[PDB]
C-alpha cells in the first residue's frame, strides 16, 4: 500500500503507510488511553515518539521533566548504575522486547498495559519523618502526582532487577511479568506489594 519508487530503496514495511506513528514501528500511541485523573497531564504519551531514545535537554528546568515520554523514563530507569547508564541501546532493546512480551500475553496492545501498571503501582500516600529526636516517628502525608509516577517507575524497575538478579529469567521477561501483574491488582508484583506496604504504614501513622 502506497508504493514509492526509489533508487536507494528502503524496506517496504517501513515504506508502506506509516504516517501512523508507531513506537517500535509496530506499537502506536493511538488508542492508548489515560486512566487516572490525578495522573493525566503527568504522562507524556501525548507526543508520538519514534523510539525510546532522545537526547533531549530534559533536566535543565524544574518541571520540564513531565515533557519526557513515559517510554523514555522507563528505559532511563532500566539503566542501572554506572554500568547501565553507559548503555542506552541495551535498555532500549530490553524495553522493546518487554512490550513484545506484553503483546504476546493476553494481547491488550501493550502500551495501555504498561501505563495501567504505572497508575496502579503508585502510592498516593506516604510517611514523613517529622518528630525531632525524641519522638522520632513518621506521620501521614499524601503524594504528588509526579512523585506518584516516579515511585511507580522505581518500584517497577526495582522489582524487575531484584527478581532478575542472578536468576535465569531474563530482565525483559521479569519486567514484562511485573508490568502485567501491576496492570492488574495481584500482590505477586513486587511494585504493588511495596505500594500496599507504604499505604499500610501510612494508615498506621495517620
Amino acid at each position: 500500500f502506497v508504493p514509492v519508487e526509489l533508487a536507494t530503496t528502503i524496506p517496504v514495511e517501513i515504506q508502506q503507510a506509516q504516517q501512523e506513528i508507531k513506537l517500535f514501528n509496530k506499537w502506536s500511541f493511538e488508542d492508548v488511553e489515560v486512566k487516572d485523573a490525578s495522573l493525566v497531564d503527568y504522562i507524556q504519551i501525548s507526543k508520538p515518539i519514534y523510539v525510546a531514545h532522545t537526547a533531549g535537554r530534559y533536566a535543565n528546568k524544574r518541571f520540564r521533566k513531565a515533557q519526557c515520554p513515559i517510554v523514555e523514563r522507563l528505559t532511563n530507569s532500566l539503566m542501572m548504575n554506572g554500568r547501565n547508564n553507559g548503555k542506552k541501546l541495551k535498555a532500549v532493546r530490553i524495553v522493546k522486547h518487554t512490550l513484545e512480551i506484553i503483546n504476546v500475553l493476553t494481547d491488550q496492545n501493550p502500551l495501555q498495559v504498561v501505563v495501567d501498571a504505572i497508575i496502579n503501582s503508585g502510592p498516593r500516600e506516604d510517611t514523613t519523618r517529622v518528630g525531632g529526636g525524641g519522638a522520632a516517628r513518621r506521620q501521614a502525608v499524601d503524594v504528588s502526582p509526579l512523585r506518584r509516577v516516579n515511585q511507580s517507575i522505581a518500584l517497577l524497575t526495582i522489582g524487575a532487577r531484584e527478581a532478575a538478579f542472578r536468576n535465569i529469567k531474563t530482565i525483559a521477561e521479569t519486567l514484562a511479568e511485573e508490568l502485567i501483574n501491576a496492570a492488574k491488582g495481584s500482590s505477586t508484583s513486587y511494585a504493588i506489594k511495596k505500594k500496599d506496604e507504604l499505604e499500610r504504614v501510612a494508615k498506621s501513622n495517620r
Partner: protein, 150 residues
C-alpha cells in the same frame, strides 16, 4: 515439615496475643513471622516496639528468637498483620510464654509423627489435634489426659 498453624484458622483474630520470631528488617521494623498462630507475615513498626529509649537497635531486635506480640489490626482479604511489641505487660508476658510452650510441645509431637509417617502434617492436625482441642480446649491437656485415660 512445619506447617498447619497450631490454632484453628489462618488469619489471627482481633486483639489475640501471639509470639513472633524476628526474620528480616528493612527500615520500618520487624516484618516477621509468628510462632504461636499462623506463620503469615506481619508488620512491626519500630515505635510499636520499644518501651525504653531506642538505644541499641541490634541488641534489641534479636533475630532468630521468639518474642511477645499483640495484634492490633488484621488483613483478612489479602493477608497481612499489624502486630506490636508495646501493648504488653509482665503478667501478660507470663501467659505469653505459657502459650509458647503449649504450642511448642504439640508441634514437636505432631511433627515427629508426620516426619515418621511421611503423612502430611496438616492431615495430622485435622484428624487428631483439632478434635482434641475441641473436646478439651487444648491438645496438650488432652495428651496429658490420654496418658491416664485411653
Amino acid at each position: 515439615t512445619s506447617h498447619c498453624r497450631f490454632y484453628e484458622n489462618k488469619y489471627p483474630e482481633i486483639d489475640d496475643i501471639v509470639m513472633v520470631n524476628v526474620q528480616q528488617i528493612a527500615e520500618m521494623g520487624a516484618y516477621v513471622k509468628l510462632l504461636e498462630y499462623d506463620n503469615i507475615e506481619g508488620m512491626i513498626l519500630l515505635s510499636e516496639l520499644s518501651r525504653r529509649r531506642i538505644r541499641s537497635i541490634q541488641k534489641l531486635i534479636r533475630v532468630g528468637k521468639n518474642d511477645v506480640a499483640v495484634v492490633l489490626r488484621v488483613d483478612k482479604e489479602k493477608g497481612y498483620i499489624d502486630l506490636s511489641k508495646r501493648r504488653v505487660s509482665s503478667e501478660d508476658i507470663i501467659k505469653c510464654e505459657e502459650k509458647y510452650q503449649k504450642s511448642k510441645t504439640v508441634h514437636s509431637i505432631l511433627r515427629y509423627c508426620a516426619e515418621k509417617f511421611q503423612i502430611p502434617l496438616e492431615e495430622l492436625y485435622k484428624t487428631i489435634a483439632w478434635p482434641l482441642s475441641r473436646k478439651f480446649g487444648h491438645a496438650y491437656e488432652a495428651f496429658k489426659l490420654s496418658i491416664i485415660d485411653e
